[PDB]
């Protein structure tokens, strides 16, 4: 099941982006990754700054890998506990990175 709400995004946001409430606009924005327990849902359909309405998951069980966590979110447990007070549930993480660059001279 997917819920809808007005969107107040400032940039492009793909599916699986964690959302939070903006107390000023009363609209949903992308979760900063700094406000503990402020995450209200997970974006279901890719949207941006022009999108009026956001389609998001307000309930469900999601893997840690599947969710597109923001850069500012550094703490693993704070990411797991971001959906506190909601019907959302999180699991476990992976290990390395694989984009190889070779600079010479």
């Amino acid at each position: 099941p997917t819920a809808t709400a007005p969107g107040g995004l400032s940039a492009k946001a793909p599916a699986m982006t964690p959302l939070m409430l903006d107390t000023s606009s009363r609209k949903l924005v992308a979760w900063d990754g700094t406000t503990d327990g402020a995450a209200v849902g997970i974006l279901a359909v890719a949207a941006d700054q022009t999108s009026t309405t956001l389609t998001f998951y307000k309930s469900g069980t999601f893997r840690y890998e599947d969710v597109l966590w923001p850069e500012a979110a550094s703490d693993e447990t704070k990411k797991r506990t971001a959906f506190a007070g909601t019907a959302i549930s999180i699991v476990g993480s992976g290990s390395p990175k694989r984009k190889r660059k070779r600079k010479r001279k």
Binding site: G92, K101, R102, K103, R104
Partner: protein, 323 residues
């Protein structure tokens, strides 16, 4: 000083052109802030134009400059793309000159180290058909460079991985797992690992290609580098569906994985615990096979390891198994 050198790249004087090209090559190796200075000076269209040069010395030098610019950030890799480098680079793949060929591969591999849009741009330019053909090359230097770019392409999204599969790269990569050359084997394992990191249809294609028998045999390797890559690939296959998890068990991976839980190598151990943890998250039939292999007592003991990474991976694996 830099915009004078850019104008000098099209100058009729041969000493002026070569000296500017040499100076700009030296700047392009001095970090992203220096790479950006070259880009903002507008050297990119001139460098791309020189890839059509009848002078092999100039072609090589402009190609080397572009390759070092392509080692920069995604905004700098995109600037190389927007300058029309890709059609020229895909043509240099048909070159009988092994020096230009290796340099074109290195540049394409560096472009494929950017984002998904950057990797897609390499694909749209038709780089993949030439790369799959280079996998049959007797030239060990060219083979590795082709395997390296293929791997960086397969490091993108699911559609970028499917583009590698549809190009017919999987049968060659599997045949390359039987290679006595440790460098070619490592690179063939690295590409397969990136292919198995996608979705379930991509993981199935790897299984259909016959990668698992060689992958299981490579777990009895004394080479830590070959071992880590074979493990990482098996772990990524095991992160798929239950039927895919069953293909791993059917090949006889579990006795080798359980034996690897005895390792004092924290790198091999973390990957062995992760691979079993992925197998353990499947159905009842798969869970029973893991218990039958004797993993239960090992996973429980590894929960008392001093290192938090091993401790957490063992805890996660045991949790997924007993739930």
């Amino acid at each position: 000083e830099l915009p004078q050198m850019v104008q000098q790249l099209n100058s009729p004087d041969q000493q002026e052109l070569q000296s500017a090209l040499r100076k700009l090559s030296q700047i392009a190796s001095g970090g992203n802030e220096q790479i950006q200075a070259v880009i903002d000076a507008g050297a990119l269209p001139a460098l791309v134009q020189l890839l059509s040069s009848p002078n092999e010395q100039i072609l090589q030098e402009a190609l080397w400059t572009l390759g070092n610019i392509a080692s920069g950030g995604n905004e700098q890799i995109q600037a190389v793309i927007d300058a029309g480098a890709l059609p020229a680079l895909v043509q240099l793949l048909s070159s009988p000159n092994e020096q230009i060929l290796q340099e074109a591969l290195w540049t394409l591999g560096n472009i494929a180290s950017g984002g998904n849009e950057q990797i897609q741009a390499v694909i749209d330019a038709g780089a993949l058909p030439a790369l799959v053909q280079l996998l049959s090359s007797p030239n060990e230097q060219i083979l590795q460079e082709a395997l390296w770019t293929l791997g960086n392409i397969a490091s993108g999204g699911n559609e970028q991985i499917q583009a590698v599969i549809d190009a017919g790269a999987l049968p060659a990569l599997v045949q390359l797992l039987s290679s006595p050359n440790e460098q070619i084997l490592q690179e063939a394992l690295w590409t397969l690992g990136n292919i198995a990191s996608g979705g379930n249809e991509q993981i199935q294609a790897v299984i259909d290609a016959g990668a698992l028998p060689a992958l299981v045999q490579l777990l009895s390797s004394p080479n830590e580098q070959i071992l880590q890559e074979a493990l990482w690939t098996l772990g990524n296959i095991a992160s798929g569906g239950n039927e895919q998890i069953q293909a791993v068990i059917d090949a006889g991976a579990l006795p080798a994985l359980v034996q690897l839980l005895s390792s004092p190598n924290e790198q091999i151990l973390q990957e062995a615990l992760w691979t079993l943890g992925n197998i353990a998250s499947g159905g009842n039939e798969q869970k029973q096979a893991v218990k039958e292999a004797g993993a239960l007592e090992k996973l429980e003991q590894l929960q008392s390891h001093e290192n938090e990474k091993i401790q957490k991976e063992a805890q996660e694996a045991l949790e997924k198994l007993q739930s």
